[PDB]
Amino acid sequence: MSFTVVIPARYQSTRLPGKPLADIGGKPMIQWVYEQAMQAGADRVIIATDDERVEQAVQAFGGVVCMTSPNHQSGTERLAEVVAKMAIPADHIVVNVQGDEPLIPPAIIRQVADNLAACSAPMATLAVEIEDEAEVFNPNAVKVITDKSGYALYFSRATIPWDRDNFAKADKAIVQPLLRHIGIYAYRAGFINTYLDWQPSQLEKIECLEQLRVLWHGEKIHVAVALEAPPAGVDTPEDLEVVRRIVAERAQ
Amino acid sequence: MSFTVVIPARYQSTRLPGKPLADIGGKPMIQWVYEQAMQAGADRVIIATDDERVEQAVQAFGGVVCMTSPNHQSGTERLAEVVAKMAIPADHIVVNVQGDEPLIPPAIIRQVADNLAACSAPMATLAVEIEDEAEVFNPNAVKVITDKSGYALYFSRATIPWDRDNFAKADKAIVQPLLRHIGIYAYRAGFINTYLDWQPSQLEKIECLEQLRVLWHGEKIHVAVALEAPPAGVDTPEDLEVVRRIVAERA
Ligand code: NA
């Protein structure tokens, strides 16, 4: 089994402008993500960016970088262009890892690739078990449920499975965990064009969940519990200071 | 196409006791459902009951009765007993119609049987579009969403699909309908036993939705919008009088 990791780097942010290049212990944020991907055993790692500053910084650590169009609308159109420009074969496993995750556990990057290779779905993703009321009823925490083979039945901002008996109480009891989707995906490279070209579903627009396109078109997404729950993506100066502390402590 | 209709008619009811034998225009409620099933083109209609009062009454209008277990059974459990007891062949289509729907449109009984015959799936069912907030956010109203071919993705007591933008608002806006599942099923007779003997999912117990067992084992359930939206069933005395006046309005 071999797989390639593609990491989109988004330069623009009102809270952390130039985020991919934020210095963390002497390396830009994007380099840390790159290096987590290498530690996962990826045969190849590719930063996708539309900003020349990112290109230059990645070249300066010897990283592979693919320049993509500034006019893309979704991170799937972006991934599609990398697959085309870098000539990635249709059967090759690609893992999409967000460029704002410098502390992503390498084991889960490998996990999602391994899961895709082992199953009959063209796409694989992961979830974390949740049981705190905060996230269980939080529409920003996307819930997912699976069949006996691990294929997703549905993803939703609604609280799925609804516990009829325990959620009626008004003092809503949580007696078993739910599964919260995490934003890491593995695809057969050729499937990315299939996904891209499929007629958009109404479901995906109502829920604001792109992956519902796949379900609506009758195709499968494998889902597994992540081996280790990943830290949240870095969005603010406060989040960045937390990562700087963790990274500094990794040298102590 | 040929199908059999099985109509469960439990006498005991907390909301309306002895309901299958509640009078409507001179006939017990059960007789009205039976007559609607006959109008649908059913090869055969079977009333499934565990009470001999229902048995006597159905035989008195000339209906076929199958006696089922007087112990607590689930929906599938009851239906599987009839299928097993009368040795219904595995490839025969069985439509399960509730004994408390005296005004069920014969056309939708035929629809669910037709839909099942038109595909390879072991199971078919129906839904109605809903927009009323009291139904949309009610866990007693089971929601369903389908793929592009009409196969169920999930059934839930949660409000699905969640409209991110519109349901965040203090007064939630319903800008497209949802689908409410209605309790009419068609199955391949043999599938019913498989369904019965399958390893149970956790999902089915949490949501209290038996049909999630099927989705968990990865088998398909086809779902279509009812060709005619059924009238309300009968759960309470109030509901009964609604039917009584509908029938009275005809004469
Ligand atoms: Na340390």
Swiss-Prot record, chain B:
Entry keyword set: Cytoplasm, Lipopolysaccharide biosynthesis, Nucleotidyltransferase, Transferase
Catalytic activity annotation: 3-deoxy-alpha-D-manno-oct-2-ulosonate + CTP = CMP-3-deoxy-beta-D-manno-octulosonate + diphosphate
Keyword ATP-binding: no
Compartments, record wording: Cytoplasm
Molecular function via GO: 3-deoxy-manno-octulosonate cytidylyltransferase activity
Involved pathway(s): Nucleotide-sugar biosynthesis; CMP-3-deoxy-D-manno-octulosonate biosynthesis; CMP-3-deoxy-D-manno-octulosonate from 3-deoxy-D-manno-octulosonate and CTP: step 1/1; Bacterial outer membrane biogenesis; lipopolysaccharide biosynthesis
EC class: transferase
Gene Ontology biological process: CMP-keto-3-deoxy-D-manno-octulosonic acid biosynthetic process; lipopolysaccharide biosynthetic process
GO cellular component: cytosol
EC number, as in UniProt: 2.7.7.38
Protein family: Belongs to the KdsB family.
Record function comment: Activates KDO (a required 8-carbon sugar) for incorporation into bacterial lipopolysaccharide in Gram-negative bacteria.
UniProt-recorded name of the protein: 3-deoxy-manno-octulosonate cytidylyltransferase
Native organism: Vibrio cholerae serotype O1 (strain ATCC 39315 / El Tor Inaba N16961)
